[PDB]
Structure formats: structure tokens, C-alpha cells
């Protein structure tokens, strides 16, 4: 059989367009201290972000609708995302090493997947 898990998670930036009307995007963000970045920590099953199938825990949010968030604070990042409108254009980049700093007992394996012991 041909298992996905062995395959490396792409590390280059991607464009994700989520259409969520007037409901939550369905994911959590962490970070936003001293320009450490804004990262996805949790995606809600069945939510708009999940239904896109193009975002994952450990993704850094680089921008929303053209607004650079690489250096944003967590609160202003949340404000930007919550007020982004019905159609939300995210530029994300998978940064599992930087993300693993946040979640207890986490680490990155050989394929780039975030593992928690």
C-alpha cells in the first residue's frame, strides 16, 4: 500500500481561500509575542477551515486578505481574522519546528509531522 504519512509535508507558502459567510473559521491560533509568529494550534472538525482541507496544525498564518501577520500580536491577529469578511484569503506556511515550542511534549518526526508524546 502507498501511505501518505511517509511523504514530506510541503513547506512552501500556500494560498487558502475559505468561504465561511458569517460563521467562525473554525480554528485556534497561538503565538504573537515578540514577532514569533501566529500559528494554527487546533482545527475544528466540520468547520470551514476543516472543510477546506488545506490548513493544518503547525501552519503559520503569513497573511489574511493581504494583511501581513508575520509579526502580529495574537489579539490583533484574531481581530483581523474575525473581521476578514465572508471570503478569507490566507497565506500559510507549515512551520512545525517553531510551532512545537508551544505545545507540551511535542516534536517533529522525519516526515515533518508534529508528534506529541
Amino acid at each position: 500500500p502507498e501511505f501518505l504519512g511517509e511523504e514530506d509535508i510541503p513547506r512552501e507558502p500556500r494560498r487558502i481561500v475559505i468561504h465561511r459567510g458569517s460563521t467562525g473559521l473554525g480554528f485556534n491560533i497561538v503565538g504573537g509575542e515578540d514577532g514569533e509568529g501566529i500559528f494554527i494550534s487546533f482545527i475544528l472538525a466540520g468547520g470551514p477551515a476543516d472543510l477546506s482541507g488545506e490548513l493544518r496544525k503547525g501552519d503559520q498564518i503569513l497573511s489574511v486578505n493581504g494583511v501581513d501577520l508575520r509579526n502580529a500580536s495574537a489579539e490583533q491577529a484574531a481581530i483581523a481574522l474575525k473581521n476578514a469578511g465572508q471570503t478569507v484569503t490566507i497565506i500559510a506556511q507549515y512551520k512545525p519546528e517553531e510551532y512545537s515550542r508551544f505545545e507540551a511534549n511535542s516534536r517533529v518526526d522525519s516526515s515533518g509531522r508534529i508528534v506529541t508524546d
Partner: peptide, 7 residues
């Protein structure tokens, strides 16, 4: 430090 928000 830290903060986590649902969006």
C-alpha cells in the same frame, strides 16, 4: 506571554 484565540 502566550494567548490563544478561537477564530
Amino acid at each position: 506571554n502566550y494567548k490563544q484565540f478561537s477564530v
